[PDB]
């Protein structure tokens, strides 16, 4: 997809005015620089490949990271799935109002030894389990209970030292597009909850160790990476100016439009 | 000449002697729902003359240092004739609008407005943890005003109405990406927009969800010499187009 | 028993790759697509619309709507300067936050010509002419009308047609320019001067204002996507 090349021009004196227009009509001008001056015939070989949608969004970015301790009670992590807990992916998705994409979820799991007290600590390789629960199903509440038996829930196992795990998830929604904004309540009496958090129901994500409590505590940490594929976008939007403050809504504090210079003529 | 239009709809007619062109949506005219995208299981009701007409909202006064107004369109017509009666008895419904903002002045005044029509405008509350209530977001056929100073955080449930952030967090200058027209009092007298139905679901409820918002922001403020008439009003006139409803129930 | 050999680059996680991956939900049936109006096929459909430029910062108008209005009075002498700013659409604080500049701050290189639309939002009887110059670099910023008329300019008269389009051409030694600030690939200066005065009849307010839009022409292109510096985060939300 190349761009338009500039044709030659000649000096004119006529009744045709390409420069003088009216911008009250909500119509930006289609003026080419070969209309207000004298140009030469140049050929453009540049391309708009990197400014397409799929080359703009299909890049991996972290969304959340949680820790959990091996030799403990309540050592297992959980996370409701939403893309509004970071500041560099959330700003990119709020350029469009409605989106539609697949994913390629990728986890990077690290580990770190805790200050144990016993001597001659030798640990084997650790094993981790990432369980995905669709919205509505039973949730586990302890590290060892029998709800971790994933009778139907898809879940991956992973030992340390290998390549990071990766799975792909298709477009799981009720409506035809992920609505990034929702101006309206959730109940017909117009009370209580207002805004985007009435559409967010995409399921949770449970993580835990598989090995037992051998001789020394281990505190792990898992980071999650999104990657949208086959993206379509509708209804573009001005980009966010003020900083984010909350996850569930768009509350902000007012700030100036730009930073300031000293006068109107100083370059 | 390219300065006269005559829009007729139902039993009403809007004529103008000095106006710009007609900005139509994102390049698409409002049409009915086809059978490829339909999801309801039953027959829709198309009144098509009792609703598709020009309703006129309430006037607002353009003072010398004003800030702006907004209307939250799909329930501004909640009490307006037979459009406000089919909205209560039905469960679903899709529409497309035809906004026509008009404001006239002499050849000695000056000023400039910006008439946008944004879809899915989430507003921000004054307090950080709270969210604005229903009464402060939309008025029944009456404009809510912006404020040239900022709203304090000590208020519980109030819309943050600083004009230079437009209530949504974006810069106010970047609002021109939406369909929009300028009412410049030098050359223009009215602005027209034709908006199609923009939503992710083919039919939506009308009482819980306001999928459009019409904002009017004065960029160059109204100024006149002493002696001229100081009272300049602004009137908005909305007309739905190709409306159909579904799912009959009791009144609510 | 096919003999293979793993090359370097195995078992790494490159954040910008393109591979296949096994699905977690087999035989899922997605929701069918719908013709929602206004589909963006490319990011350069966004940066060809107008956006009002805050040319009037001056540290008192940045927290107001006063920043977009350029003041124009009726003088007593000729050749005064209306405004002036260098043309760096990714680093200069004037063009930093418009819709054009907010896409260039995601990329690194850019190339093409830039339009500049003005609109005289004054009275109906006021008249005057303006000069809209553009000086490629190498010299300083022009100081007078006599020095600024040498570059690329256009003389604009206000009438029934209110608007005017100065189209800054693409004059550069390289095929691209940096978004961030650089001495080596500077682009020049944009100035504007009174050609004649602004005459008004009696009982008319004297000071008229001017808006100024910006957009890109149909040969604009970007390259080398990066992250943006206009956002900041310390903890999660």
């Amino acid at each position, epitope marked *: 997809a190349r761009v338009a090349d500039t044709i030659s021009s000649r000096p004119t004196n006529s009744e045709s005015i390409p420069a003088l227009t009216a911008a009250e009509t909500g119509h930006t001008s289609q003026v080419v620089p070969s209309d207000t001056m004298q140009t030469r015939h140049v050929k453009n070989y540049h391309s708009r490949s990197e400014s397409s949608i799929e080359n703009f969004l299909c890049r991996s970015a972290c969304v959340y990271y949680a820790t959990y301790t091996n030799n403990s009670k309540k050592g297992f992590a959980e996370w409701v799935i939403n893309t509004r807990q970071v500041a560099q992916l959330r700003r990119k998705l709020e350029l469009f109002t409605y989106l539609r994409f697949d994913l390629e979820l990728t986890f990077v799991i690290t580990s770190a030894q805790q200050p144990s007290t016993a001597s001659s600590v030798d640990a084997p390789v650790q094993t981790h389990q990432i369980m995905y629960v669709p919205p509505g199903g039973p949730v586990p509440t302890k590290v060892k209970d029998y709800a971790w038996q994933t009778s139907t829930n898809p879940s991956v196992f992973w030992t340390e030292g290998n390549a990071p795990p990766r799975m792909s998830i298709p477009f799981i929604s009720i409506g035809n597009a992920y609505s990034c904004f929702y101006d309206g309540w959730t109940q017909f009496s117009r009370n209580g909850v207002y805004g985007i958090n009435t559409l967010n129901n995409m399921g949770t994500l449970y993580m835990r160790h598989v090995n037992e409590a051998g001789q020394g505590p281990i505190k792990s940490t898992v980071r999650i990476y999104f990657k949208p594929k086959h993206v379509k976008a509708w209804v573009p939007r001005p980009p966010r100016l003020c900083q984010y403050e909350k996850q569930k809504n768009v509350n902000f*504090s007012p700030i*100036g439009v730009t930073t300031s210079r000293t006068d109107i003529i100083t370059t | 000449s390219d300065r006269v239009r005559s829009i007729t709809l139902g039993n009403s007619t809007i004529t103008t002697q000095e106006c710009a062109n007609v900005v139509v949506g994102y390049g698409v005219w409002p049409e009915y729902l086809k059978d490829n995208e339909a999801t309801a299981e039953d027959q829709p009701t198309q009144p098509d003359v009792a609703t598709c007409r020009f309703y006129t909202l309430e006037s607002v006064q353009w*003072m*010398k*240092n*004003s*800030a702006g107004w907004w209307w939250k369109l799909p329930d501004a017509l909640s009490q307006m004739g037979l459009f406000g009666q089919n909205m209560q008895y039905h469960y679903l419904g899709r529409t497309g609008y035809t906004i026509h903002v008009q404001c006239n002045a002499s050849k000695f005044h000056q000023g400039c407005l910006l008439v946008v029509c944004v879809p899915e405008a989430e507003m921000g509350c004054s307090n950080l943890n709270n969210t604005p209530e229903f009464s402060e977001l939309s008025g029944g056929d009456s404009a809510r*005003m912006f*404020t*040239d*100073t900022q*709203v*304090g*955080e*000590s208020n519980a449930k109030k819309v943050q109405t600083a004009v230079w952030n437009a209530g949504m967090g974006v810069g106010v200058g970047n609002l021109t990406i939406f369909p929009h027209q300028w009412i410049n009092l030098r050359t223009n007298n009215s602005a027209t927009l034709v908006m199609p139905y923009i939503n992710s679901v083919p039919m939506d409820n009308m009482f819980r969800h306001n999928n459009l918002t019409l904002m009017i922001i004065p960029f160059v*403020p109204l100024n006149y010499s002493e002696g001229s008439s100081p009272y300049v009003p602004i009137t908005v006139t909305i007309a739905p187009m190709c409306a159909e409803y579904n799912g009959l129930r009791l009144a609510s | 028993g096919l003999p293979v050999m793993t090359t370097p680059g195995s078992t790494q996680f490159l954040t910008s790759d393109d591979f296949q991956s096994p699905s977690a939900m087999p035989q899922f049936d997605v929701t069918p697509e719908m013709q929602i109006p206004g589909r963006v096929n490319n990011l350069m459909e966004i940066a060809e619309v107008d956006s009002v430029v805050p040319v009037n910062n001056t*540290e*008192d*108008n940045v*927290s*107001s709507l*006063k920043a977009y*209005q350029i003041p124009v009075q009726s003088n007593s002498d000729n050749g005064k300067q209306v405004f002036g700013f260098p043309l760096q659409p990714g680093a200069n604080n004037v063009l930093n936050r418009t819709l054009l500049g907010e896409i260039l701050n995601y990329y690194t290189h850019w190339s093409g010509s830039i339009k500049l639309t003005f609109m005289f939002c004054g009275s109906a009887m006021a008249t005057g002419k303006f000069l809209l110059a553009y000086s490629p670099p190498g010299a300083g910023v022009p100081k007078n009308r006599k020095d600024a008329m040498l570059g690329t300019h256009v003389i604009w008269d206000v009438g029934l047609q209110s608007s005017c389009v100065l189209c800054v051409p693409w004059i550069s030694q390289t095929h691209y320019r940096y978004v961030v600030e650089d001495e080596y690939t500077a682009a020049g200066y944009v100035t504007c001067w009174y050609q004649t005065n602004i005459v008004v009849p009696a009982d008319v307010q004297s000071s008229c204002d001017i808006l100024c839009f910006v957009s890109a022409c149909n040969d604009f292109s970007v390259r080398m996507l990066k992250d943006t510096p206009f956002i900041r985060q310390d903890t999660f939300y």
Partner: antibody
Amino acid sequence: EVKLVESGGGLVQPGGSLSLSCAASGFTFTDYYMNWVRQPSGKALEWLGFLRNKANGYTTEYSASVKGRFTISRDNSQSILYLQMNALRAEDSATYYCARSRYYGGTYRYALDYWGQGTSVTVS
Amino acid sequence: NVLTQSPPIMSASPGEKVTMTCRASSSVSSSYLHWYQQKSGASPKLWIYSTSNLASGVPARFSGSGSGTSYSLTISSVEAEDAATYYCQQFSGYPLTFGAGTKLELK
């Protein structure tokens, strides 16, 4: 010229109510922000709240310590300003001013240019 | 947010160069800083607005400056009429706060 006088002060018992009034003359009352600033005996100033003009909808903006107990309002007929006091304590004894403000550029800086002569309110 | 003025009590002979400071805790904009003047037992009065602009009725000896979190007010020569108290006002968020006050003593 700008002239603001006020009256209504005096000794009022703790827990009581009180109504102050600030009268304005010499300018159009519906175009200027009107503030309420109090000051204790020989101490620093303290701002209580203001009331916007007709162009912004006559909303009020109180401080953090006086919300729920105080109330600013104006009358529609003539140029007169009110201040409703409720649930007074011992530390509400001060000198109460009534200041005006205006737009300096095209914008609104937050200075208070013309001040009232100062009425006294004490409690016991 | 809180303002700190320093020093609180200052003496001044006629003819000397005199300056007082007004230091904020957090950063304020330069357009929202003002300076007031209150004499002995009278109403206050606006003296400097937006940290560099002289108000109405003020002589041309007064001149303020500063940026960020440090600001100053400089008088060229001390007279017998400008012996009073000076406050500084800021606004970054609600509420508007005032300084402690700088008391100027004639000598």
